[PDB]
Amino acid sequence: EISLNGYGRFGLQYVEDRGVGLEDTIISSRLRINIVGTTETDQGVTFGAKLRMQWDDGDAFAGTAGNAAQFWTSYNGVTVSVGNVDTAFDSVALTYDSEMGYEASSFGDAQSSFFAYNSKYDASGALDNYNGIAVTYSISGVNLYLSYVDPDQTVDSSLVTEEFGIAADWSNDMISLAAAYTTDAGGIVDNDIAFVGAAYKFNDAGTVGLNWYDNGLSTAGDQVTLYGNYAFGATTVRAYVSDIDRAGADTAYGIGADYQFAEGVKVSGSVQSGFANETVADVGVRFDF
Amino acid sequence: EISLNGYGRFGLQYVEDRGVGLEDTIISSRLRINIVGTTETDQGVTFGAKLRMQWDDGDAFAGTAGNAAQFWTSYNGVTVSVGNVDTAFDSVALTYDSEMGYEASSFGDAQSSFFAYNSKYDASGALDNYNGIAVTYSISGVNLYLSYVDPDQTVDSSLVTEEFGIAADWSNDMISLAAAYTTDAGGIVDNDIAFVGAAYKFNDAGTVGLNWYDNGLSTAGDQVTLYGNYAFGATTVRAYVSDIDRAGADTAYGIGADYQFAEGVKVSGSVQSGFANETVADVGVRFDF
Amino acid sequence: EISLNGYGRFGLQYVEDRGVGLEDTIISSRLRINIVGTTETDQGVTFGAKLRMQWDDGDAFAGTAGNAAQFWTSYNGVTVSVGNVDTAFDSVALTYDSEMGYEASSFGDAQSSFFAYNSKYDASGALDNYNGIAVTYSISGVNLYLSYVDPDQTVDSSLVTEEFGIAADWSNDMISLAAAYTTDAGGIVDNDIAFVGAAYKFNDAGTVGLNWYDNGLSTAGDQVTLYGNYAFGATTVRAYVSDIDRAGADTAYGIGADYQFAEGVKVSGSVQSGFANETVADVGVRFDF
């Protein structure tokens, strides 16, 4: 069995003083197609592989290709995956819940480098032998994530730096907890990052959360992000503030809205201010097919 | 929802004195696959995106990839599209109705340069930031086309040349009219081209038309094409003659046949003579799946 | 109509002293997707085209693309195909029946060069104009294969070397015969190879065969391969020995197992010894979706 899913999204992307001779506002857009092949068995074991074809405005050659394969085996809630795998740091909950706009962005996201699912190919050749192993398990309420990544599996281990990450989240009807730890993130020695987050669903239509990060060797340093959103029926209001230890940095913040036009169609917009006092705004549509 | 459609076609392509050391006749063939994702809503609005993977004999690397995405929104007969869009000049009626053979060709087609849907990627990098906006509307019988194209949307407007094109066609049961105008066609300054065409369906199985072109900065100059076809049940006979103002040019002409083998399978052939006295012939099959 | 089929496979690949500074064991894996478009007619004729997207661990750019198209027409058991076609030498029976492991390998396979379906693109540019014609016909029990391949169809014939191959196999319930002949294999002049094989199904769960090869200009020389397998319900045991005329060569051999975990899921493993005394072992899974 092979199924095809994906999405499209487009709108206006603005960034003040984007560059001399350059247009501040452009029409950013993206097309994503996921190709998933699965083989189910009566022994209760599922085999699957997926491939992704994704194009973005600006992409080289005005072309679209597939990325590197991912394979997995699920059984009794346990899933082992190989190849181009999702990572623990990128997989945990709450960590990206401050994002807004149609391009789902936020300076409130972690400011560190770490491996995460590669959607496109890479011309540099850097990923040619990038292979990983990931494991997840859901013990009702609790979620476990373990990922191991070798940027070049053909070379003798001791010669390369592997990334290892552990992560877990839990959640009842009103409180949520999440923690994650990754050593040698992004294959960079001593680049040990960490996340700890908590959220409170102070109602059905609203939630306030707090994320704290240890950005490893990032010049950003430790960082805390405070966000919240509220749902007035079909439209959602979002806001957040973020701070990093880097000297002289500005407090990052953003305010935005979501409008569920229909099932599958979502209109979003936002205005954000980065740590270097950058100003960015967006408004677009996203449709899932 | 994601649907896959497309077609295949192959046969013999002949061109007299194709080049020293080169074979005049080769087996030309093409595979085209369209990937269309759509999201319908009960509000009566449709969202969609499409991608194309097309290979042609001769293609570099003996490979096939996807091109740059196209997105659109339809509502009440009005459709707005973004990205790799169809253009007014390329979209109007009658303009390509003189073509024949399995590769659908004719020296009777307009001899000017202008933007039109890009089916493949482009290694030059020329299309990396090529973005367009197109609008069409059907007021029963009449068809409106408007397209705006910026070959590099990242650069400040005033620095690049955009193509703008308007076009409209109308048609009852026996008469058809079509006109089109595009300024700075193909992004070339002062390259303003125009088309005007009329056709008469002098019966159910036959039609005679006349197309006049203003090829902008093309050395071809103004051009008039006269074509006609007749259907004897399953086989269609086609013919045409074309003239351009370029000095010393030859009158272009071609005679060909279509044979509807089945629904979806079409056999075609033709012999044509170009303005530079080139001789070309073809015979092949085309199947839509 | 367009259908999507394919498979995924992964496991451990071992090869003793794979190279200085290199890891002997790696996780080899593959994803294959076949895109097939067909157009059926009530005249009893079928038109089709297929494309392949296949990724392998190690692939450049960590990307995946499509290869060069193949088209065909089937009628009354006769099938004519064009473009990237399957060849007679690669298509006959018994010739690859000694292979084992999840990567289906065997030093017992023919040691000659010859054209065969190209699954991926080729950066060298070598296949840009590689076009072929193949014909097969099944006269109940007997199978005929004819293939003609021109590595560069644009160039004048006399300037390039074409590969031509004939092949046929037959088979009742317990005996099987197969022969094949290809001249200028792989487009190499005087590289005439041949195969002759016979197999006996000495039971429902077992088979012993013998393949003899004339490897044309290969330094391997003539070669004979002896293989056999036995099925104990769900697990299959395989073994083989191979010899070539090349001076000082070692006798190649391998022993392996297959385990049909479910319909579509197959676990395999093997240990093999090459003619140059190479040691290789593998164990993996393959799932068809």
From Swiss-Prot, chains A, B, C:
Oxidoreductase recorded as keyword: no
GO MF: porin activity
Superkingdom field: Bacteria
Biological process, per Gene Ontology: monoatomic ion transport
Compartment(s) where it occurs, according to its Swiss-Prot or TrEMBL record: Cell outer membrane
Cross-referenced InterPro entries: Gram_neg_porin_domain (IPR033900), Porin_dom_sf (IPR023614)
Membrane topology recorded in Swiss-Prot or TrEMBL: Multi-pass membrane protein
A single cellular component GO annotation: pore complex
Pfam families attached to this UniProt entry: Porin_4
Key words, A-Z: Cell outer membrane, Ion transport, Membrane, Porin, Transmembrane, Transmembrane beta strand, Transport
Summary of the function given for this chain in its UniProt record: Forms channels that allow the passive diffusion of small hydrophilic solutes up to an exclusion limit of about 0.6 kDa.
Quaternary state and interactors: Homotrimer.
Protein name: Porin
Species per Swiss-Prot/TrEMBL record: Fuscovulum blasticum (Rhodobacter blasticus)
Primary gene name: opmA
